[PDB]
Design an enzyme around this catalytic site. Structure first.
Site, PDB file in Angstrom:
ATOM      1  N   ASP A  46       0.875  -1.178   0.000  1.00 31.64           N
ATOM      2  CA  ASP A  46       0.000   0.000   0.000  1.00 31.64           C
ATOM      3  C   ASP A  46       0.912   1.227   0.000  1.00 31.64           C
ATOM      4  O   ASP A  46       1.521   1.550   1.026  1.00 31.64           O
ATOM      5  CB  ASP A  46      -0.925   0.019   1.222  1.00 31.64           C
ATOM      6  CG  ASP A  46      -1.930  -1.144   1.257  1.00 31.64           C
ATOM      7  OD1 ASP A  46      -1.731  -2.180   0.614  1.00 31.64           O
ATOM      8  OD2 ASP A  46      -2.947  -1.018   1.973  1.00 31.64           O
TER       9      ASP A  46
ATOM     10  N   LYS B  10      -7.203   3.458  -2.118  1.00 27.96           N
ATOM     11  CA  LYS B  10      -7.369   3.423  -0.670  1.00 27.96           C
ATOM     12  C   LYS B  10      -7.513   4.849  -0.156  1.00 27.96           C
ATOM     13  O   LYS B  10      -6.832   5.757  -0.642  1.00 27.96           O
ATOM     14  CB  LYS B  10      -6.145   2.715  -0.027  1.00 27.96           C
ATOM     15  CG  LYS B  10      -6.089   2.686   1.484  1.00 27.96           C
ATOM     16  CD  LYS B  10      -4.984   1.712   1.951  1.00 27.96           C
ATOM     17  CE  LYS B  10      -4.677   1.886   3.433  1.00 27.96           C
ATOM     18  NZ  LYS B  10      -3.502   1.041   3.862  1.00 27.96           N
TER      19      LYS B  10
ATOM     20  N   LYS C 200     -10.572   0.420  -0.837  1.00 26.69           N
ATOM     21  CA  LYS C 200     -10.309   0.181   0.583  1.00 26.69           C
ATOM     22  C   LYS C 200     -10.487   1.451   1.402  1.00 26.69           C
ATOM     23  O   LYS C 200      -9.634   2.339   1.339  1.00 26.69           O
ATOM     24  CB  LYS C 200      -8.892  -0.371   0.768  1.00 26.69           C
ATOM     25  CG  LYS C 200      -8.440  -0.526   2.223  1.00 26.69           C
ATOM     26  CD  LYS C 200      -7.122  -1.276   2.233  1.00 26.69           C
ATOM     27  CE  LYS C 200      -6.443  -1.178   3.594  1.00 26.69           C
ATOM     28  NZ  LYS C 200      -5.083  -1.825   3.553  1.00 26.69           N
TER      29      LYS C 200
END
Length: 248
Positions: free
Chosen positions: A100, A165, A199
């Protein structure tokens, strides 16, 4: 209503600890927590140096398919591609299943759209070679403006993000339903629902919170869209709230 949503949300969790002073013991405890009486979380999310001990802990408790995610260019989202790429390569070497990376959101706010593309693209190419998924954190709470949230999402997707995200969890404002809708609308508008997951991370505290995020997903993409390849919750305390809603 909350029982069905909580069982879905639990199996989509990236169960997270990302503290300046985490220890092997805390990562081991987190791995054990990821194996619940009602299912395993999708992943854990830890700093790279803890990947080896987490991997052995997950194997020894018989849950070898819980993915190990980590973070790079984190939490700052600085615009130095060499550092972000070096960190991403190091995370791959440490054994990450997923990386990430923080998008260079302050550079985007300053008018530079290209550096975000080049950074994400470079990190994606390293990850893809290693069969490692790349999520891109755009830091919606610091972007703030809807147009910048859309633009960062678009750039990340064009550059090859496997997930977009919301947040690092390390700034004042992280996931909100508003930001989640904006980012999922981009996935929809770009036609990448098959290949780009979403996310929300940070600020997802309760089973009730989780249910709202999944309701947006179901509305935009159908109830069969959310799964581990297309949806995660970046969260921690949430897990106990989900288990409580399920009677544990």
């Amino acid at each position: 209503d909350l029982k069905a949503s909580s069982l879905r949300a639990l199996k989509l969790m990236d169960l997270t600890t990302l503290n300046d002073d985490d220890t092997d013991e805390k990562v081991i405890a987190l791995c054990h927590q990821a194996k619940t009486p009602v299912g395993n979380t999708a992943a854990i999310c830890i700093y790279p140096r803890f990947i080896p001990i987490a991997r052995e802990t997950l194997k020894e408790q018989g849950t070898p398919e819980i993915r190990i995610a980590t973070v790079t260019n984190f939490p700052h989202g600085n615009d130095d591609i060499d550092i972000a790429l070096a960190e991403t390569r190091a995370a791959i070497a440490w054994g990450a299943d997923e990386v990430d990376v923080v998008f260079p959101y302050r550079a985007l706010m300053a008018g530079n759209e290209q550096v975000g593309f080049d950074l994400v693209k470079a990190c994606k190419e390293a990850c893809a070679a290693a069969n490692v998924l790349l999520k891109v954190i755009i830091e919606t709470g610091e972007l703030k403006d809807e147009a910048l949230i859309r633009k960062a999402s678009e750039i990340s997707i064009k550059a090859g993000a496997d997930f977009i995200k919301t947040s690092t969890g390390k700034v004042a404002v992280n996931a909100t339903p508003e930001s989640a809708r904006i980012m999922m609308e981009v996935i929809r508008d770009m036609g990448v629902e098959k290949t780009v997951g979403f996310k929300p991370a940070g600020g997802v505290r309760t089973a009730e919170d989780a249910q709202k995020y999944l309701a947006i997903a179901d509305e935009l993409f159908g109830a069969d869209w959310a799964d581990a390849r297309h949806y995660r919750f970046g969260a921690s305390s949430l897990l106990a709230s989900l288990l409580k809603a399920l009677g544990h």
